[PDB]
Structure 1
Amino acid sequence: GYDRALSIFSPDGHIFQVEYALEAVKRGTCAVGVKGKNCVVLGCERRSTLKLQDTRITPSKVSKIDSHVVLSFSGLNADSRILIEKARVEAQSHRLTLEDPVTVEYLTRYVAGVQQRYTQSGGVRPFGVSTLIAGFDPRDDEPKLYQTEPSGIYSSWSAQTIGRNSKTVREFLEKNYDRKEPPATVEECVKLTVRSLLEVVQTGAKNIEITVVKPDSDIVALSSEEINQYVTQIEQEKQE
Structure 2
Amino acid sequence: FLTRSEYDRGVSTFSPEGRLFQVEYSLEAIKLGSTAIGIATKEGVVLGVEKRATSPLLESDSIEKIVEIDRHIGCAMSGLTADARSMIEHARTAAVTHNLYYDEDINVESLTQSVCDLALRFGEGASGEERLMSRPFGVALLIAGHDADDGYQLFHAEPSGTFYRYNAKAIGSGSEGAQAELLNEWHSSLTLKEAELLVLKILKQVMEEKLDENNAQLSCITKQDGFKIYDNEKTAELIKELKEKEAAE
TM-score, length of structure 2 as denominator length: 0.86
Distance 2:159 2:12 in 1: 12
1:170 alignment partner in structure 2: 179
Q: 1:119 to 1:40 in 2, by over 3 A?
A: farther
Distance 1:34 1:64 in 2: 17
Task: Give the SS at the match of 1:92.
Answer: helix
Match of 1:204 among 202, 211, 217: 211
Match of 1:225 among 213, 223, 233: 233
Match of 1:113 among 110, 113, 117: 117
| Consecutive unaligned residues in structure 2, runs of 5 or more | 1-8, 126-130
Q: CA deviation at 1:7?
A: 3.3
Distance 1:7 1:52 in 2: 43
Size of the aligned set, in residue pairs, is 232
1:17 alignment partner in structure 2: 22
Aligned residue identity for 2:78: S
Kept in 2, the 8 Å contact 1:7–1:125? The answer is no
Distance 1:200 1:38 in 2: 25
| Consecutive unaligned residues in structure 1, runs of 5 or more | none
Q: What is the root-mean-square deviation of aligned Cα atoms in Å?
A: 2.0
Task: Give the SS at the match of 2:28.
Answer: helix
Q: Does 1:90 align with 2:74?
A: no
Distance 1:119 1:162 in 2: 27
Distance 1:166 1:104 in 2: 23
Kept in 2, the 8 Å contact 1:136–1:216? The answer is no
Q: Does 1:234 align with 2:242?
A: yes
Q: CA deviation at 1:55?
A: 4.1
TM-score, length of structure 1 as denominator length: 0.89
Q: 1:74 to 1:20 in 2, by over 3 A?
A: same
1:79 alignment partner in structure 2: 83
Distance 2:12 2:229 in 1: 38
Q: 1:109 to 1:119 in 2, by over 3 A?
A: farther
Q: 1:120 to 1:68 in 2, by over 3 A?
A: farther
Q: Which moved more, 1:67-76 or 1:224-233?
A: 224-233
Deviations, residues 161-189 of structure 1 (Å, cap 9, x unaligned): 1111101011111111013x1x22x3212
Distance 2:123 2:205 in 1: 34
The correspondence of residues 54-65 of structure 1 with structure 2, limited to 5 A, is 54-55=59-60, 57-58=62-63, 60-65=64-69
1:215 alignment partner in structure 2: 223
1:190 alignment partner in structure 2: 196
Kept in 1, the 8 Å contact 2:51–2:60? The answer is no
Match of 1:43 among 31, 40, 48: 48
Distance 2:28 2:93 in 1: 28
Distance 1:217 1:144 in 2: 16
Distance 1:116 1:68 in 2: 26
Kept in 1, the 8 Å contact 2:168–2:182? The answer is yes
Task: Give the SS at the match of 1:170.
Answer: helix
Q: 1:35 to 1:75 in 2, by over 3 A?
A: same
Q: Which moved more, 1:216-225 or 1:43-52?
A: 216-225
1:67 alignment partner in structure 2: 71
Task: Give the SS at the match of 2:194.
Answer: helix
Match of 1:148 among 149, 157, 172: 157
